[PDB]
Tab-separated table of N, CA and C and ligand atoms in Angstrom:
chain	number	residue	atom	x	y	z
A	1	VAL	N	19.562	-9.055	3.363
A	1	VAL	CA	19.664	-7.701	3.893
A	1	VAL	C	19.159	-6.693	2.864
A	2	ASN	N	18.371	-5.726	3.329
A	2	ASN	CA	17.835	-4.657	2.493
A	2	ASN	C	18.045	-3.322	3.202
A	3	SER	N	17.649	-2.237	2.535
A	3	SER	CA	17.976	-0.886	2.974
A	3	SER	C	16.865	-0.219	3.781
A	4	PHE	N	15.813	-0.947	4.143
A	4	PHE	CA	14.779	-0.377	4.999
A	4	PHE	C	15.333	-0.189	6.409
A	5	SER	N	15.085	0.986	6.993
A	5	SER	CA	15.697	1.384	8.256
A	5	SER	C	14.641	1.845	9.254
A	6	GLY	N	14.835	1.480	10.523
A	6	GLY	CA	14.001	1.996	11.591
A	6	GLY	C	12.647	1.344	11.742
A	7	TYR	N	12.441	0.164	11.161
A	7	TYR	CA	11.167	-0.533	11.262
A	7	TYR	C	11.118	-1.408	12.506
A	8	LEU	N	9.933	-1.486	13.101
A	8	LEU	CA	9.643	-2.447	14.152
A	8	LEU	C	9.201	-3.743	13.485
A	9	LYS	N	9.763	-4.862	13.933
A	9	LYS	CA	9.397	-6.167	13.403
A	9	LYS	C	8.147	-6.647	14.126
A	10	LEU	N	7.098	-6.973	13.371
A	10	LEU	CA	5.886	-7.539	13.958
A	10	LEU	C	5.849	-9.059	13.895
A	11	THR	N	6.282	-9.636	12.778
A	11	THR	CA	6.281	-11.079	12.566
A	11	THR	C	7.512	-11.440	11.744
A	12	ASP	N	7.584	-12.707	11.337
A	12	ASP	CA	8.687	-13.148	10.492
A	12	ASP	C	8.858	-12.275	9.253
A	13	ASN	N	7.769	-11.705	8.732
A	13	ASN	CA	7.797	-11.060	7.423
A	13	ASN	C	7.175	-9.671	7.361
A	14	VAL	N	6.564	-9.175	8.437
A	14	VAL	CA	5.878	-7.888	8.435
A	14	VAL	C	6.588	-6.934	9.384
A	15	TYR	N	6.913	-5.754	8.862
A	15	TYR	CA	7.599	-4.681	9.559
A	15	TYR	C	6.743	-3.422	9.481
A	16	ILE	N	6.904	-2.502	10.438
A	16	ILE	CA	6.032	-1.329	10.504
A	16	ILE	C	6.795	-0.115	11.025
A	17	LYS	N	6.429	1.066	10.516
A	17	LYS	CA	7.107	2.313	10.855
A	17	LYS	C	6.132	3.475	10.702
A	18	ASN	N	6.299	4.500	11.539
A	18	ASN	CA	5.558	5.755	11.389
A	18	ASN	C	6.306	6.604	10.366
A	19	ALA	N	5.793	6.663	9.135
A	19	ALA	CA	6.513	7.360	8.074
A	19	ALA	C	5.570	7.768	6.951
A	20	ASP	N	6.017	8.767	6.184
A	20	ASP	CA	5.353	9.220	4.967
A	20	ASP	C	5.868	8.374	3.809
A	21	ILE	N	4.969	7.601	3.196
A	21	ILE	CA	5.371	6.632	2.179
A	21	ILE	C	6.058	7.312	1.003
A	22	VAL	N	5.687	8.560	0.701
A	22	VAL	CA	6.353	9.288	-0.378
A	22	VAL	C	7.825	9.494	-0.047
A	23	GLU	N	8.103	9.998	1.156
A	23	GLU	CA	9.486	10.251	1.548
A	23	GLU	C	10.264	8.951	1.711
A	24	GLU	N	9.611	7.899	2.209
A	24	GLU	CA	10.274	6.604	2.325
A	24	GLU	C	10.671	6.072	0.954
A	25	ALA	N	9.754	6.139	-0.012
A	25	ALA	CA	10.067	5.652	-1.352
A	25	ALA	C	11.209	6.447	-1.969
A	26	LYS	N	11.175	7.774	-1.836
A	26	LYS	CA	12.252	8.589	-2.391
A	26	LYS	C	13.597	8.213	-1.781
A	27	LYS	N	13.617	7.903	-0.483
A	27	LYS	CA	14.865	7.528	0.178
A	27	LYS	C	15.304	6.121	-0.216
A	28	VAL	N	14.392	5.151	-0.141
A	28	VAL	CA	14.784	3.758	-0.345
A	28	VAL	C	14.870	3.397	-1.825
A	29	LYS	N	14.015	3.976	-2.658
A	29	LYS	CA	13.840	3.552	-4.042
A	29	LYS	C	13.619	2.038	-4.084
A	30	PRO	N	12.573	1.547	-3.427
A	30	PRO	CA	12.351	0.105	-3.362
A	30	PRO	C	12.011	-0.455	-4.727
A	31	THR	N	12.138	-1.773	-4.835
A	31	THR	CA	11.723	-2.444	-6.058
A	31	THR	C	10.237	-2.238	-6.315
A	32	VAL	N	9.421	-2.294	-5.263
A	32	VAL	CA	7.974	-2.170	-5.385
A	32	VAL	C	7.457	-1.235	-4.297
A	33	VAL	N	6.765	-0.170	-4.701
A	33	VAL	CA	5.917	0.602	-3.801
A	33	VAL	C	4.464	0.292	-4.134
A	34	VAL	N	3.647	0.091	-3.098
A	34	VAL	CA	2.225	-0.171	-3.269
A	34	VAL	C	1.455	1.138	-3.196
A	35	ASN	N	0.580	1.350	-4.180
A	35	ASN	CA	-0.384	2.438	-4.146
A	35	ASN	C	-1.742	1.931	-3.690
A	36	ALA	N	-2.396	2.734	-2.850
A	36	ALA	CA	-3.779	2.520	-2.428
A	36	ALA	C	-4.693	3.081	-3.517
A	37	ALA	N	-4.909	2.274	-4.551
A	37	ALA	CA	-5.589	2.699	-5.763
A	37	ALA	C	-7.101	2.512	-5.663
A	38	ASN	N	-7.812	3.149	-6.595
A	38	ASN	CA	-9.199	2.817	-6.895
A	38	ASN	C	-9.267	2.182	-8.286
A	39	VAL	N	-10.438	1.640	-8.630
A	39	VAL	CA	-10.557	0.848	-9.854
A	39	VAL	C	-10.304	1.656	-11.109
A	40	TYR	N	-10.473	2.976	-11.047
A	40	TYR	CA	-10.268	3.855	-12.190
A	40	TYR	C	-8.855	4.409	-12.259
A	41	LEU	N	-8.009	4.058	-11.292
A	41	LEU	CA	-6.679	4.641	-11.152
A	41	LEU	C	-6.721	6.168	-11.201
A	42	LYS	N	-7.729	6.749	-10.547
A	42	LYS	CA	-7.828	8.199	-10.400
A	42	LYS	C	-7.187	8.568	-9.071
A	43	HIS	N	-5.974	9.107	-9.139
A	43	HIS	CA	-5.138	9.288	-7.954
A	43	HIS	C	-5.354	10.684	-7.369
A	44	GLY	N	-6.458	10.829	-6.644
A	44	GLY	CA	-6.870	12.144	-6.187
A	44	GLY	C	-6.416	12.549	-4.800
A	45	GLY	N	-6.391	11.602	-3.867
A	45	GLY	CA	-6.187	11.924	-2.471
A	45	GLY	C	-5.580	10.752	-1.733
A	46	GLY	N	-5.366	10.946	-0.435
A	46	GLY	CA	-4.730	9.920	0.358
A	46	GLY	C	-3.361	9.573	-0.192
A	47	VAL	N	-2.988	8.301	-0.038
A	47	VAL	CA	-1.697	7.835	-0.539
A	47	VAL	C	-1.593	8.061	-2.043
A	48	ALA	N	-2.653	7.730	-2.782
A	48	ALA	CA	-2.596	7.808	-4.239
A	48	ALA	C	-2.340	9.235	-4.700
A	49	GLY	N	-3.070	10.197	-4.135
A	49	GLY	CA	-2.821	11.585	-4.482
A	49	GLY	C	-1.399	12.003	-4.162
A	50	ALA	N	-0.874	11.534	-3.027
A	50	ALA	CA	0.478	11.896	-2.615
A	50	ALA	C	1.531	11.272	-3.530
A	51	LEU	N	1.407	9.976	-3.824
A	51	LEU	CA	2.363	9.348	-4.734
A	51	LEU	C	2.326	10.023	-6.095
A	52	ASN	N	1.128	10.292	-6.608
A	52	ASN	CA	1.039	10.874	-7.941
A	52	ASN	C	1.663	12.266	-7.975
A	53	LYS	N	1.358	13.098	-6.974
A	53	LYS	CA	1.936	14.433	-6.906
A	53	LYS	C	3.458	14.368	-6.928
A	54	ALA	N	4.039	13.404	-6.207
A	54	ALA	CA	5.489	13.259	-6.159
A	54	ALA	C	6.083	12.873	-7.508
A	55	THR	N	5.301	12.244	-8.389
A	55	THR	CA	5.731	11.939	-9.757
A	55	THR	C	5.434	13.061	-10.742
A	56	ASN	N	4.993	14.222	-10.262
A	56	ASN	CA	4.681	15.341	-11.150
A	56	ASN	C	3.573	14.974	-12.144
A	57	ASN	N	2.633	14.126	-11.711
A	57	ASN	CA	1.467	13.671	-12.476
A	57	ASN	C	1.819	12.609	-13.519
A	58	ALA	N	3.071	12.157	-13.601
A	58	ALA	CA	3.396	11.109	-14.563
A	58	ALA	C	2.664	9.810	-14.243
A	59	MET	N	2.458	9.513	-12.958
A	59	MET	CA	1.686	8.330	-12.592
A	59	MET	C	0.268	8.393	-13.159
A	60	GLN	N	-0.381	9.558	-13.065
A	60	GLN	CA	-1.735	9.701	-13.592
A	60	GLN	C	-1.763	9.548	-15.110
A	61	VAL	N	-0.794	10.143	-15.810
A	61	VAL	CA	-0.741	10.040	-17.270
A	61	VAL	C	-0.613	8.579	-17.694
A	62	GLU	N	0.302	7.847	-17.053
A	62	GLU	CA	0.468	6.431	-17.354
A	62	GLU	C	-0.798	5.649	-17.030
A	63	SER	N	-1.427	5.979	-15.899
A	63	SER	CA	-2.630	5.276	-15.469
A	63	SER	C	-3.793	5.500	-16.429
A	64	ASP	N	-3.931	6.718	-16.953
A	64	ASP	CA	-5.027	6.994	-17.873
A	64	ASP	C	-4.883	6.172	-19.148
A	65	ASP	N	-3.652	6.009	-19.635
A	65	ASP	CA	-3.421	5.140	-20.782
A	65	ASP	C	-3.736	3.687	-20.444
A	66	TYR	N	-3.352	3.232	-19.244
A	66	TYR	CA	-3.667	1.865	-18.828
A	66	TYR	C	-5.176	1.611	-18.845
A	67	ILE	N	-5.960	2.535	-18.276
A	67	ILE	CA	-7.412	2.356	-18.210
A	67	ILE	C	-8.034	2.420	-19.603
A	68	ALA	N	-7.554	3.332	-20.446
A	68	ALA	CA	-8.099	3.418	-21.797
A	68	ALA	C	-7.915	2.108	-22.550
A	69	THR	N	-6.829	1.392	-22.278
A	69	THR	CA	-6.560	0.129	-22.959
A	69	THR	C	-7.281	-1.047	-22.313
A	70	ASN	N	-7.295	-1.100	-20.979
A	70	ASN	CA	-7.676	-2.306	-20.257
A	70	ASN	C	-8.990	-2.207	-19.507
A	71	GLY	N	-9.529	-1.012	-19.319
A	71	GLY	CA	-10.688	-0.840	-18.482
A	71	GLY	C	-10.328	-0.878	-17.008
A	72	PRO	N	-11.330	-0.684	-16.155
A	72	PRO	CA	-11.074	-0.590	-14.715
A	72	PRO	C	-10.573	-1.895	-14.108
A	73	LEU	N	-9.848	-1.751	-13.004
A	73	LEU	CA	-9.507	-2.892	-12.172
A	73	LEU	C	-10.751	-3.395	-11.447
A	74	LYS	N	-10.602	-4.555	-10.814
A	74	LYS	CA	-11.576	-5.093	-9.874
A	74	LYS	C	-11.230	-4.635	-8.462
A	75	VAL	N	-12.255	-4.424	-7.633
A	75	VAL	CA	-11.990	-4.286	-6.202
A	75	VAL	C	-11.378	-5.584	-5.704
A	76	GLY	N	-10.244	-5.476	-5.007
A	76	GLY	CA	-9.441	-6.619	-4.631
A	76	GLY	C	-8.322	-6.941	-5.598
A	77	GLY	N	-8.297	-6.294	-6.766
A	77	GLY	CA	-7.313	-6.571	-7.788
A	77	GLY	C	-6.172	-5.569	-7.798
A	78	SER	N	-5.301	-5.723	-8.792
A	78	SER	CA	-4.095	-4.915	-8.873
A	78	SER	C	-3.567	-4.887	-10.298
A	79	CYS	N	-2.655	-3.948	-10.536
A	79	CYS	CA	-1.832	-3.966	-11.733
A	79	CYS	C	-0.458	-3.415	-11.383
A	80	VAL	N	0.547	-3.845	-12.138
A	80	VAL	CA	1.912	-3.356	-11.996
A	80	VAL	C	2.163	-2.299	-13.063
A	81	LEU	N	2.551	-1.103	-12.636
A	81	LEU	CA	2.936	-0.022	-13.531
A	81	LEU	C	4.302	0.502	-13.097
A	82	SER	N	4.768	1.553	-13.762
A	82	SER	CA	6.057	2.122	-13.411
A	82	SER	C	6.041	2.717	-12.004
A	83	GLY	N	7.196	2.670	-11.344
A	83	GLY	CA	7.380	3.394	-10.107
A	83	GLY	C	7.890	4.804	-10.291
A	84	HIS	N	8.140	5.218	-11.530
A	84	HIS	CA	8.564	6.591	-11.847
A	84	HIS	C	9.808	6.917	-11.030
A	85	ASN	N	9.868	8.076	-10.385
A	85	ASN	CA	11.012	8.495	-9.599
A	85	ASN	C	10.995	7.940	-8.183
A	86	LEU	N	10.013	7.118	-7.829
A	86	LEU	CA	9.838	6.663	-6.455
A	86	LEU	C	10.291	5.231	-6.201
A	87	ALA	N	10.279	4.375	-7.219
A	87	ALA	CA	10.511	2.947	-7.058
A	87	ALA	C	10.700	2.381	-8.454
A	88	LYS	N	11.189	1.146	-8.540
A	88	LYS	CA	11.229	0.509	-9.852
A	88	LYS	C	9.815	0.329	-10.400
A	89	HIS	N	8.931	-0.254	-9.591
A	89	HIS	CA	7.564	-0.550	-9.969
A	89	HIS	C	6.612	0.004	-8.928
A	90	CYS	N	5.403	0.326	-9.372
A	90	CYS	CA	4.291	0.599	-8.473
A	90	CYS	C	3.237	-0.483	-8.662
A	91	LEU	N	2.915	-1.180	-7.574
A	91	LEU	CA	1.802	-2.120	-7.546
A	91	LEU	C	0.565	-1.365	-7.073
A	92	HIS	N	-0.346	-1.082	-8.005
A	92	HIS	CA	-1.599	-0.403	-7.690
A	92	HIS	C	-2.579	-1.456	-7.209
A	93	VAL	N	-2.975	-1.395	-5.938
A	93	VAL	CA	-3.851	-2.392	-5.327
A	93	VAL	C	-5.130	-1.708	-4.877
A	94	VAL	N	-6.275	-2.290	-5.228
A	94	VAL	CA	-7.576	-1.733	-4.877
A	94	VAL	C	-8.123	-2.483	-3.668
A	95	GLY	N	-8.045	-1.871	-2.493
A	95	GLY	CA	-8.789	-2.355	-1.358
A	95	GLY	C	-10.222	-1.858	-1.417
A	96	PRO	N	-11.134	-2.537	-0.730
A	96	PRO	CA	-12.509	-2.039	-0.669
A	96	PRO	C	-12.586	-0.690	0.032
A	97	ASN	N	-13.427	0.197	-0.510
A	97	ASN	CA	-13.669	1.522	0.066
A	97	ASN	C	-14.997	1.474	0.816
A	98	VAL	N	-14.905	1.389	2.148
A	98	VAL	CA	-16.093	1.285	2.989
A	98	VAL	C	-17.011	2.483	2.786
A	99	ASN	N	-16.446	3.655	2.498
A	99	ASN	CA	-17.276	4.821	2.215
A	99	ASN	C	-18.012	4.715	0.880
A	100	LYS	N	-17.808	3.627	0.127
A	100	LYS	CA	-18.602	3.293	-1.050
A	100	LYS	C	-19.486	2.071	-0.827
A	101	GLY	N	-19.475	1.491	0.372
A	101	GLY	CA	-20.254	0.303	0.670
A	101	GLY	C	-19.648	-1.009	0.215
A	102	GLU	N	-18.354	-1.040	-0.083
A	102	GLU	CA	-17.737	-2.231	-0.650
A	102	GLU	C	-17.405	-3.259	0.431
A	103	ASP	N	-17.398	-4.527	0.024
A	103	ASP	CA	-17.326	-5.645	0.959
A	103	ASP	C	-15.944	-5.717	1.602
A	104	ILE	N	-15.888	-5.521	2.922
A	104	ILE	CA	-14.617	-5.562	3.633
A	104	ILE	C	-13.941	-6.914	3.491
A	105	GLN	N	-14.712	-7.976	3.227
A	105	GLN	CA	-14.122	-9.284	2.970
A	105	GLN	C	-13.145	-9.243	1.807
A	106	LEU	N	-13.282	-8.266	0.906
A	106	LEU	CA	-12.366	-8.158	-0.219
A	106	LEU	C	-10.989	-7.667	0.199
A	107	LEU	N	-10.810	-7.247	1.452
A	107	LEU	CA	-9.498	-6.785	1.885
A	107	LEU	C	-8.466	-7.906	1.829
A	108	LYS	N	-8.860	-9.130	2.180
A	108	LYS	CA	-7.914	-10.237	2.100
A	108	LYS	C	-7.469	-10.464	0.660
A	109	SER	N	-8.419	-10.465	-0.282
A	109	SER	CA	-8.067	-10.602	-1.694
A	109	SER	C	-7.093	-9.511	-2.126
A	110	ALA	N	-7.315	-8.283	-1.658
A	110	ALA	CA	-6.419	-7.185	-2.010
A	110	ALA	C	-4.998	-7.470	-1.529
A	111	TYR	N	-4.851	-7.890	-0.267
A	111	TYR	CA	-3.519	-8.175	0.260
A	111	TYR	C	-2.852	-9.362	-0.432
A	112	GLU	N	-3.634	-10.312	-0.964
A	112	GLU	CA	-3.032	-11.449	-1.664
A	112	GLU	C	-2.155	-11.002	-2.827
A	113	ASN	N	-2.454	-9.849	-3.428
A	113	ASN	CA	-1.614	-9.362	-4.517
A	113	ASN	C	-0.171	-9.159	-4.073
A	114	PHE	N	0.047	-8.844	-2.791
A	114	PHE	CA	1.404	-8.602	-2.314
A	114	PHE	C	2.267	-9.857	-2.434
A	115	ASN	N	1.652	-11.048	-2.399
A	115	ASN	CA	2.426	-12.287	-2.405
A	115	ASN	C	3.119	-12.553	-3.728
A	116	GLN	N	2.803	-11.777	-4.765
A	116	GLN	CA	3.479	-11.899	-6.051
A	116	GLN	C	4.797	-11.134	-6.106
A	117	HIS	N	5.213	-10.516	-4.998
A	117	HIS	CA	6.421	-9.701	-4.939
A	117	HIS	C	7.190	-10.031	-3.670
A	118	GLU	N	8.494	-10.268	-3.808
A	118	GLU	CA	9.271	-10.759	-2.672
A	118	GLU	C	9.400	-9.726	-1.556
A	119	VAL	N	9.485	-8.442	-1.908
A	119	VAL	CA	9.650	-7.357	-0.946
A	119	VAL	C	8.853	-6.152	-1.439
A	120	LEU	N	8.121	-5.498	-0.533
A	120	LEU	CA	7.306	-4.337	-0.886
A	120	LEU	C	7.329	-3.300	0.223
A	121	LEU	N	7.274	-2.028	-0.180
A	121	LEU	CA	6.922	-0.908	0.692
A	121	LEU	C	5.448	-0.609	0.459
A	122	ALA	N	4.655	-0.521	1.528
A	122	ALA	CA	3.211	-0.482	1.340
A	122	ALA	C	2.527	0.333	2.428
A	123	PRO	N	1.318	0.826	2.152
A	123	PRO	CA	0.432	1.367	3.182
A	123	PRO	C	-0.532	0.280	3.645
A	124	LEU	N	-1.241	0.570	4.732
A	124	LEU	CA	-2.338	-0.288	5.161
A	124	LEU	C	-3.531	-0.120	4.225
A	125	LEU	N	-3.890	-1.200	3.539
A	125	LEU	CA	-4.963	-1.153	2.557
A	125	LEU	C	-6.293	-0.859	3.231
A	126	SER	N	-7.105	-0.053	2.556
A	126	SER	CA	-8.443	0.349	2.962
A	126	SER	C	-8.454	1.261	4.185
A	127	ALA	N	-7.293	1.663	4.699
A	127	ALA	CA	-7.222	2.597	5.812
A	127	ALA	C	-7.367	4.033	5.308
A	128	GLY	N	-7.224	4.988	6.222
A	128	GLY	CA	-7.338	6.386	5.834
A	128	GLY	C	-8.685	6.670	5.204
A	129	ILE	N	-8.666	7.387	4.074
A	129	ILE	CA	-9.905	7.827	3.438
A	129	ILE	C	-10.724	6.690	2.843
A	130	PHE	N	-10.186	5.464	2.781
A	130	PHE	CA	-10.984	4.315	2.362
A	130	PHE	C	-11.895	3.791	3.477
A	131	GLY	N	-11.760	4.296	4.701
A	131	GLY	CA	-12.791	4.139	5.711
A	131	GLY	C	-12.814	2.843	6.496
A	132	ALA	N	-11.813	1.976	6.361
A	132	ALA	CA	-11.794	0.751	7.146
A	132	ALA	C	-11.031	0.961	8.455
A	133	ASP	N	-11.195	0.008	9.369
A	133	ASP	CA	-10.479	0.030	10.643
A	133	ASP	C	-9.027	-0.356	10.402
A	134	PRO	N	-8.062	0.525	10.674
A	134	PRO	CA	-6.656	0.169	10.412
A	134	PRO	C	-6.140	-0.993	11.246
A	135	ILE	N	-6.640	-1.174	12.471
A	135	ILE	CA	-6.226	-2.332	13.258
A	135	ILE	C	-6.612	-3.615	12.537
A	136	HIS	N	-7.827	-3.653	11.991
A	136	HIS	CA	-8.254	-4.807	11.212
A	136	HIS	C	-7.392	-4.983	9.969
A	137	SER	N	-7.106	-3.892	9.260
A	137	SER	CA	-6.282	-4.001	8.063
A	137	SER	C	-4.907	-4.578	8.379
A	138	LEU	N	-4.264	-4.104	9.450
A	138	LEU	CA	-2.972	-4.667	9.835
A	138	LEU	C	-3.102	-6.153	10.141
A	139	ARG	N	-4.184	-6.541	10.818
A	139	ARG	CA	-4.408	-7.950	11.117
A	139	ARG	C	-4.527	-8.768	9.831
A	140	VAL	N	-5.326	-8.286	8.877
A	140	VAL	CA	-5.465	-8.997	7.612
A	140	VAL	C	-4.127	-9.065	6.893
A	141	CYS	N	-3.365	-7.971	6.906
A	141	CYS	CA	-2.047	-7.983	6.278
A	141	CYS	C	-1.181	-9.101	6.857
A	142	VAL	N	-1.057	-9.136	8.183
A	142	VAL	CA	-0.194	-10.116	8.833
A	142	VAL	C	-0.655	-11.536	8.536
A	143	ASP	N	-1.966	-11.746	8.464
A	143	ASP	CA	-2.524	-13.077	8.261
A	143	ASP	C	-2.643	-13.472	6.790
A	144	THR	N	-2.259	-12.603	5.858
A	144	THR	CA	-2.408	-12.873	4.428
A	144	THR	C	-1.095	-12.793	3.670
A	145	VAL	N	-0.298	-11.759	3.929
A	145	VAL	CA	0.949	-11.548	3.213
A	145	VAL	C	2.020	-12.456	3.796
A	146	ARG	N	2.688	-13.201	2.918
A	146	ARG	CA	3.779	-14.089	3.281
A	146	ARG	C	5.132	-13.583	2.816
A	147	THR	N	5.154	-12.656	1.864
A	147	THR	CA	6.380	-12.021	1.425
A	147	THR	C	6.729	-10.883	2.387
A	148	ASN	N	7.865	-10.241	2.158
A	148	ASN	CA	8.404	-9.276	3.117
A	148	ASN	C	7.800	-7.907	2.854
A	149	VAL	N	7.001	-7.423	3.797
A	149	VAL	CA	6.276	-6.172	3.630
A	149	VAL	C	6.702	-5.180	4.702
A	150	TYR	N	7.046	-3.979	4.241
A	150	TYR	CA	7.451	-2.847	5.057
A	150	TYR	C	6.320	-1.833	4.995
A	151	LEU	N	5.582	-1.718	6.099
A	151	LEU	CA	4.389	-0.885	6.196
A	151	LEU	C	4.732	0.505	6.718
A	152	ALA	N	4.305	1.522	5.977
A	152	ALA	CA	4.454	2.917	6.366
A	152	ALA	C	3.100	3.438	6.832
A	153	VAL	N	3.038	3.894	8.081
A	153	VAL	CA	1.827	4.435	8.691
A	153	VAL	C	2.054	5.927	8.909
A	154	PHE	N	1.302	6.763	8.182
A	154	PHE	CA	1.557	8.207	8.198
A	154	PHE	C	1.287	8.821	9.568
A	155	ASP	N	0.201	8.419	10.222
A	155	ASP	CA	-0.247	9.065	11.452
A	155	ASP	C	0.475	8.467	12.655
A	156	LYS	N	1.220	9.307	13.383
A	156	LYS	CA	1.996	8.826	14.526
A	156	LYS	C	1.085	8.266	15.613
A	157	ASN	N	-0.017	8.959	15.904
A	157	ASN	CA	-0.942	8.470	16.920
A	157	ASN	C	-1.511	7.101	16.542
A	158	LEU	N	-1.853	6.908	15.268
A	158	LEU	CA	-2.381	5.617	14.838
A	158	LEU	C	-1.311	4.538	14.909
A	159	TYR	N	-0.096	4.865	14.472
A	159	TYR	CA	1.014	3.925	14.550
A	159	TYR	C	1.189	3.396	15.967
A	160	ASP	N	1.240	4.298	16.952
A	160	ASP	CA	1.395	3.867	18.340
A	160	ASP	C	0.246	2.958	18.754
A	161	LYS	N	-0.977	3.301	18.347
A	161	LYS	CA	-2.120	2.448	18.649
A	161	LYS	C	-1.988	1.100	17.955
A	162	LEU	N	-1.482	1.101	16.719
A	162	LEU	CA	-1.284	-0.147	15.984
A	162	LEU	C	-0.243	-1.030	16.664
A	163	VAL	N	0.878	-0.439	17.076
A	163	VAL	CA	1.913	-1.202	17.771
A	163	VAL	C	1.385	-1.716	19.104
A	164	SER	N	0.837	-0.813	19.920
A	164	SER	CA	0.441	-1.176	21.277
A	164	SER	C	-0.717	-2.164	21.294
A	165	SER	N	-1.535	-2.185	20.243
A	165	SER	CA	-2.672	-3.091	20.172
A	165	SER	C	-2.372	-4.359	19.383
A	166	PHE	N	-1.157	-4.504	18.855
A	166	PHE	CA	-0.854	-5.644	17.998
A	166	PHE	C	-0.750	-6.924	18.813
A	167	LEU	N	-1.426	-7.970	18.348
A	167	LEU	CA	-1.381	-9.250	19.031
A	167	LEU	C	-0.367	-10.155	18.350
B	1	LIG	O1	-4.357	3.644	4.049
B	1	LIG	C1	-3.816	4.832	3.639
B	1	LIG	C2	-3.007	5.517	4.800
B	1	LIG	C3	-3.909	5.926	5.991
B	1	LIG	C4	-3.254	6.977	6.914
B	1	LIG	C5	-4.177	7.546	7.991
B	1	LIG	C6	-3.232	7.916	9.132
B	1	LIG	O2	-2.027	7.236	8.917
B	1	LIG	C7	-2.118	6.429	7.792
B	1	LIG	N1	-2.281	6.658	4.236
B	1	LIG	C8	-0.948	6.872	4.120
B	1	LIG	N2	-0.052	5.969	4.664
B	1	LIG	C9	1.284	6.225	4.524
B	1	LIG	N3	1.863	7.243	3.931
B	1	LIG	C10	0.996	8.140	3.385
B	1	LIG	N4	1.333	9.275	2.703
B	1	LIG	C11	0.187	9.942	2.309
B	1	LIG	C12	-0.894	9.206	2.731
B	1	LIG	C13	-0.416	8.034	3.440
């Protein structure tokens, strides 16, 4: 039993809700919140901009030190950093950004990072400003993640389409 509330169950391990991931994290304080990161950990917009703003830019400060030491992530890769005031940990995961021409096949690799954590609060990878089809992203999530994932979908209209179109 965990403290996630109001989710629709899609499969044995995937749950979904129309919610703002920032507000969900502040309420639940999950062990792991997933950020929709880029390889430079430059948290400008979308989920990343929102999570960082909620940390008063502490996420960006920590991320800049991480990059200075380690260099950029790979598309499809991840790193674990602090969750600041939102969660114990933040798993920064880089899905492919279709608006950069990146290979959508890398979306499965991106979701594989979730399997290293027993329970996660997460967005749909490569959705929103990353330019991928969210229905496809949800499909890849369900077919790749085996650990317990609680998906927050910001847009109510998209959420309803995701639920009603889910196979
Ligand atoms: O893939 C990133 C998704 C895409 C959007 C497009 C419409 O709904 C989902 N973004 C987010 N999902 C959940 N919480 C969020 N808070 C701020 C941004 C955000």
